[PDB]
Amino acid sequence: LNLVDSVYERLLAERIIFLGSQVDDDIANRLCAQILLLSAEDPTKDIHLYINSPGGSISAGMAIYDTMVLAPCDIATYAMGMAASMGEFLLAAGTKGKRYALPHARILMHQPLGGVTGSAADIAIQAEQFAVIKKEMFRLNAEFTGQPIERIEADSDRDRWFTAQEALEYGFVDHIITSASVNGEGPGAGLD
Amino acid sequence: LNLVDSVYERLLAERIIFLGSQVDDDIANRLCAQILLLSAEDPTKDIHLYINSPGGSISAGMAIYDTMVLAPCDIATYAMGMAASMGEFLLAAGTKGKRYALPHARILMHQPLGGVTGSAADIAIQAEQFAVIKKEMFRLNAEFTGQPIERIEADSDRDRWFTAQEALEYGFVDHIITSASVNGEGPGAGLDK
Amino acid sequence: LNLVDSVYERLLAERIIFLGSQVDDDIANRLCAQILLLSAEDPTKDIHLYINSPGGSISAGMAIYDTMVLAPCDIATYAMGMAASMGEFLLAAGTKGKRYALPHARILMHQPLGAADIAIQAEQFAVIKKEMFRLNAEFTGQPIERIEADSDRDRWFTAQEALEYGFVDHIITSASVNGEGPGAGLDK
Amino acid sequence: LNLVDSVYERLLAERIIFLGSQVDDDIANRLCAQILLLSAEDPTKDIHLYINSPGGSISAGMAIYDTMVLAPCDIATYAMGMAASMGEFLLAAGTKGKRYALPHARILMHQPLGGVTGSAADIAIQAEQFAVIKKEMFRLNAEFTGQPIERIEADSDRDRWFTAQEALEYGFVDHIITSASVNGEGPGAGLD
Amino acid sequence: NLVDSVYERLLAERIIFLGSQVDDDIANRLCAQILLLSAEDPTKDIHLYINSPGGSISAGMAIYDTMVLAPCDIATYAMGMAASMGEFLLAAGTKGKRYALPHARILMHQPLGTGSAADIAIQAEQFAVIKKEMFRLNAEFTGQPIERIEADSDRDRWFTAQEALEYGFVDHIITSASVNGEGPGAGLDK
Amino acid sequence: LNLVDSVYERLLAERIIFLGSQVDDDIANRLCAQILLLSAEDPTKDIHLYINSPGGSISAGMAIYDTMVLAPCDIATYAMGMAASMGEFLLAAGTKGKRYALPHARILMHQPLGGSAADIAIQAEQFAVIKKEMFRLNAEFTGQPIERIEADSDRDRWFTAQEALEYGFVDHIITSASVNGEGPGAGLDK
Amino acid sequence: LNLVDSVYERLLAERIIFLGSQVDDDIANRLCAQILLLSAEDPTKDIHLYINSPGGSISAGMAIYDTMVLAPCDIATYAMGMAASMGEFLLAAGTKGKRYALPHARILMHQPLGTGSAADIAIQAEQFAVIKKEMFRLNAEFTGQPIERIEADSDRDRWFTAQEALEYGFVDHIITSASVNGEGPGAGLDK
Amino acid sequence: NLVDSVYERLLAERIIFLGSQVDDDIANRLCAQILLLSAEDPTKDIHLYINSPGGSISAGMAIYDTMVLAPCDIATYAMGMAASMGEFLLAAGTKGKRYALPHARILMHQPLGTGSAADIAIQAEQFAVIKKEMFRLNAEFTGQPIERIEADSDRDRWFTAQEALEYGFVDHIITSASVNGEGPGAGLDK
Amino acid sequence: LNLVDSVYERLLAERIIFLGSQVDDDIANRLCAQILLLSAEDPTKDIHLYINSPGGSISAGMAIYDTMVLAPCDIATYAMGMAASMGEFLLAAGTKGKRYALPHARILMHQPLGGVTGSAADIAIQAEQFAVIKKEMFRLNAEFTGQPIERIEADSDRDRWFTAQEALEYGFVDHIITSASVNGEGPGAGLD
Amino acid sequence: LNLVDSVYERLLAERIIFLGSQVDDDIANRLCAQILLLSAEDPTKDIHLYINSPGGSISAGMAIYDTMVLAPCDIATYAMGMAASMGEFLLAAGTKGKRYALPHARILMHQPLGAADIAIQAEQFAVIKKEMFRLNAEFTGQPIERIEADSDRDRWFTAQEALEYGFVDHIITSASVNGEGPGAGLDK
């Protein structure tokens, strides 16, 4: 009912979801809940996920990713400003053909933190989980982009970043979107 | 009526409940209330319990569990990110045949805090309660999974953890859900109503 | 749901939105969300962006700008009090012909100062700073080196000087309601 | 809404606006927004701006003033208790003929803060702006009251203040209002 | 919250409550409520209940001017304490409609003297002028000579309800609200 | 040093130490340190432990007790105001013959109800062991049977100075310190 | 100095140092500094380390241990109240023959689980595995127990009374009262 | 306090302690101590004990320049962890006088990049220059090729004491300080 | 005194002063006081001012500079890590011949805050002062380095920075010092 | 007993005291106490008051001034950085012939704004404000109406302008140690 929350709620009614912050457990729960709600309201219409996020934990990002896949809806993704670390991952995880960058977007590859510190197991068990989910993240990024997994890993290690044009050529997105199409003849970006 | 609470309330109308935090007395009260509410609203329709929880006390988790059993309707459970300690327990406690993990969910076994320290009784009485409920936690986890109770105990002792496939194999869930089915040909995950 | 937020929400129903403070990530998220919402509600009706802002982060301002371009509808801009630095940029980014200054508005040009190391952040800052210069040159019709030099010395403008330099298309004094002047979002 | 805000919102339905604190950037935004909203709802009916304000920055007051002029409807102003500094200015800026003082209101002239230090610009650039808007504030106060600009500047320098009757003679307001009229005899004060 | 909800519902009965010290925030809140009630119906009385330990002259004078601005009569009720500017606003109610409850206490007082950016000298000039108006208006409300108002105020003279009736602050003591028709309804008989 | 600490430090020079608050781990560390320090400085001179303590944990109290035993010198104890729970235990643990109560001191028996990285089961095992040993030692200090100690502790039995003397917590009541070598010097005759 | 600090500094002059809290990086720095200082002041006189500690990190404990070995002086250790986790380890690491428990001391074994590193959790885990194994090895060496017994007992948080701790090998003797005349251990109080 | 008092007394033994993360405040503190010890006696060694998890390049380079400015030799001792700039300062000790304790760990690392009022571009230019100098000096300290320093640093390569000796960070492992005369005295033999 | 302050006081006994933080009014007072104290103790011996400072206000730096000149003894300066803005200025203001940079010191030119907003005077009056002291700061930097005033102002405008060797060539310091000399061969750095 | 306070105390032994901040009741108490102490220690030796102050309360400054006059010894004053408002007043109140400005010092004239009611406080403020004007006229030799008018517009001075107007007697550049120039408190 405050202004910002009221606007997000009305955007939800247009099937538009915002990832505008660091990906942590709280944000994952919040985004996961919205994807589930939109799916329940209409499982046949696209969800539009706009991303301006400086990064996030692997664990929290993977929960959002699994919910994107769980949703029977297509999920279009839009690099609105920054898409770094798991923000890059979730952008690239959009339904193929419906992944977009705005022209001044910036995509950052990065080894994020695991987010596996929340439970009271020793560091060895946390490191085990981290190794497995990091390798899975590399593998999925390779599938999203079409790049060899060795390319993904080396670029992640050196924190390679991408302009919108470079991200398009690497394969994180399918198009750079400049202005939304409303009369047909191109992407509507959820603006009908 | 803030945005987060508003979305949770609208999910409640779909009979979807979220366990998104460490399980303590306040979260147990919260979850118990939602299960009772949904049962009272319609005792014939499934409840869908989504779990992304890093752990919790035995005492608090046992109150949720008893309320899950009290509810006349089935409770489907979904490992959405992490189901650790009593979060694993409550996931495995779902209606058999309706326990699910998403493909990258993780399940972690753990010997948790008892949650018995809030009493006005001495530590000897608190320890007596702890020993009883810890043993019963192991026994129930063995019944949920089909594992021998001695394996439950040893694996909990060493903080054994599972990928979603491994958790299905061990017995915590019945199925891995990749995409929800809107077609009847499979689990709807509460999204087809 | 306090009074201030209630008034902003009711203004949203008139397709009026406010950039009333320093541009940062929170403000950018809020403003982008409002632009997307107004676009989705009716992609054929103008959005009216009122600006009274002392500046802010290039990165946040650029994200607002890209959302302005994404929107299918025209975005009219109004310099209400101050339009400084990224506030100037977004004023000048309005749909050409629909950029306005109120009579005592002031426009100020400025070069803002800027998980991966400082080198990566500096590289990203360099591209968006260069883009801000290039686009400011395009909005105003001024040579890019004039934008750079004027920005470097914090050159500022009255409404009439801002009109002559090319940040805005017209000065509005009062709104036209019967429909042959700018209605400033107030004639519906 | 709490009680205070609910009463203000109900007064908004009567086209009554309250300026009850110092004029800073936040208050200017809130005031500008209410003026725009009331204009959009009905551009043919007066707005009634009640003023009990101890002062404010020139820059914030000028933003409010330009929005008062932008409004196609008239803005009646009422000095309810204190109208000091930019509070006096906004009182005097009401639609001529519709500027009122309650019998015990006090009007105070003052040369205030510019409110121009929020920018990242050099203090030389801030002072340039301050000199321009200060001079324009004097010129407009002279236009509002009918006093020569030299008298405005001298009286502001010495923080000259006025009772309601003295404010009427000097030219800040057009009438002292004692009780609102219920049948077109005198001013209704927005309570019609 | 509950408190605000009860006050809002009392507003629908044209009852407003001054239950605290009179400062600028309270002045704004009460002024706003009087204007709102006047706009909603300028022909119906407003009922102003007072339990206030005092407040600033400037803030109390803004309320007083709003009471006089309102076209409605304003009945006033001393509900527990009416001290300093609370006494002033009580005695400022529509004559014939000023009431004290049987155990109410009315206290006279001279408040001591600052939100302007002008020097202390200009602030003291204002205080002197409003202080003298306050005395003059208290004299007119009560029928007492201004010299008696000033002398009694400086010594913090206080009054029981019957003493306040005799002095001239209120017109009646109200023990129980009359739904009879025989007597004041205190706003409780709609 | 501030004033309070300077006075305690100067009292340390007279071999006088204070248990003036609840016995927790921090207090046990400070008292243990003071007992070690005095012992090292002169293992042949008495330490004078003044007690005005409302209680404390068994574990912290037992660490102090063990350090009192470790000390080669006698530890005289003085119930200065209250000696409750582990404060009673430590009073009663003073060198036999050198345990004193001031005339209006009060001694209270009590069962604490009970930190580690181990689970509550291991904590309760340790607690059961130290609780039983505390009852056993209280019996030896006082000469009372263990079952009386346990039952009196369970009901929070308390004692005046004279009652405490008779039960066995202290050996003498001290009213005024002796300067002339007559009786106990209370550490004040150096 | 305040009272507490003043008493600790004066104990330092008697070559007595006090481990009365959880072992973390700050405590390790404080204790390492005191050991170096006493060693510099007189490398021929014992240091007496009194321990009432509920646990601590392996990394912090091992830094203290290496400084204990670096010191040319013998380091006598005393279990004063609790000696748990790395507090047990430091007790058992005292100079052999000069490790002591007071009669009501409790000794608890524990695997301390789990980072101020700039390196990722994988590198931190590699380090932890190395120091954990070395901690088990040394504790086996201090006590005479086989490493597998040390590991299994640590895993189940086995605890010991003073008498059980003596029999297991953590300490060499139980002290009741300090001897000032040479008939037994002086506990650093006989100077 | 006690901690500061022990450090001050160690200063009288020409022993300084880097026990935390290297930031500007730590740089100022350590630089000041090296200058003070140099002024007090420019012919006697300084003993720098290191237990540090890392720190900023700029702050570590200021310390390094002060170590080189000092006319005294500076012996360095890896006491628990020497990571990132802590490794750098360890390896920067006077050659032949760099020591690791047997369970010390040495970690290589590239710190990421801001106190100036200049833009991020000028701050990144500075970081690039100091980062390259850090690699070059690590190569000279260790005898390793600069390419190996950069490659090992980016993967956070870490070392046991024996591995660090072989790689070239330190000259000796010290197990026990020698007051013999046969071996290093670690500053403990004055 | 805590440890840090005790070491600084002992360095004061060696006539060594530390400027290790931003130059504000408090730091200027502390620095001025130490310079006056060392002058009074022995006006014939050098003071050694070690500098590791990220910047500061013009007004505060000018107070320190005037006190450096007031001191009858010489003030040697040493760039220990960073000497930025008024930190560069005070470094360059050392007694000519006795200005030193350590090999990895960095010198940064910058046009800083005036520090003239503490007064109760009008912003116009503050800007007048700022213009005068800024111009004098450029003129003195030109005098210290031997560079023309136009180059000082242009380089300050672009935040030009310098390695120790570049700072030596430009004129901020007279020598790079690597190790202090113990026998009158080279500079003793106050460690003599 | 931190470093900063240790240095000030040691300066006190050179009879040097600092007015380095805004003048308020706390600063006035501290400065009066130092003047009384230095006077009691040796009433024949100069006190050296260094001033770097942006102004403050008339009442607190006047109490410092009265203590300056009470002191039997001369008080030399030094404008070290800023001497504004009551800082200017106390600079100009120094023993005539022993008032000094450092070369880049700035002097600013200013009219500060101001248990008993506001009327009593305003009356007290009026007398000390009038006294500040009268004494400033006496210190400088300027007409009282010039002090008032110049104070009213925040007139400010460089060191040389301050010397010409009469706030100080000399500009000191560097201290004279062998004894035929001002020693600034540094020659003992």
Numbering used by the authors:
A (entry chain F), D (entry chain D), I (entry chain D): 11 to 202
B (entry chain G): 11 to 203
C (entry chain E), J (entry chain E): 11 to 124, 130 to 203
E (entry chain C), H (entry chain C): 12 to 124, 127 to 203
F (entry chain A): 11 to 124, 128 to 203
G (entry chain B): 11 to 124, 127 to 203
Relevant lines from the article:
The ClpP protease is found in all kingdoms of life, from bacteria to humans. Here we show that, in contrast to this general architecture, the Clp protease from Mycobacterium smegmatis (Msm) forms an asymmetric hetero-oligomeric complex ClpP1P2, which only associates with its cognate ATPase through the ClpP2 ring. Our structural and functional characterisation of this complex demonstrates that asymmetric docking of the ATPase component is controlled by both the composition of the ClpP1 hydrophobic pocket (Hp) and the presence of a unique C-terminal extension in ClpP1 that guards this Hp. The catalytic residues (Ser-His-Asp), of this complex, are encapsulated within the barrel-shaped proteolytic chamber and access to the chamber is restricted to a narrow entry portal at either end of the complex.
The structure of MsmClpP1 was determined to 2.0 Å resolution and refined to an Rfree value of 21.5%. Similar to other ClpP structures, MsmClpP1 was composed of two heptameric rings stacked back-to-back (the asymmetric unit consisted of one heptamer, the biological tetradecamer is formed from crystallographically related heptamers). The tetradecamer forms a compact barrel-shaped oligomer with approximate dimensions 86 × 102 Å. Compared to these active structures, both MsmClpP1 and MtbClpP1, have shorter handle domains, which lack a structured β-strand region. As a result, association of the heptameric rings in MsmClpP1 (and MtbClpP1) is mediated largely by a trans association of a short section of the α-helix in the handle domain creating several openings in the side-walls of the ClpP1 tetradecamer. Significantly, the breaches in the side wall of MsmClpP1 are located adjacent to the catalytic residues of the protease and as such provide a direct path between the active site of the protease and the external solution. Hence as has been proposed by Kay and Houry33, these openings could represent an exit portal for the egress of peptides. Therefore, we postulate that this structure of MsmClpP1 represents a post “substrate-cleavage” snapshot of the protease. Another distinctive feature of MsmClpP1, which is absent in many ClpP homologues including MtbClpP124,32, is a short C-terminal extension (CTE) ~12 residues long, which docks into its own Hp. Specifically, the CTE interacts with three tyrosine residues (Y60, Y88 and Y110) within the Hp.
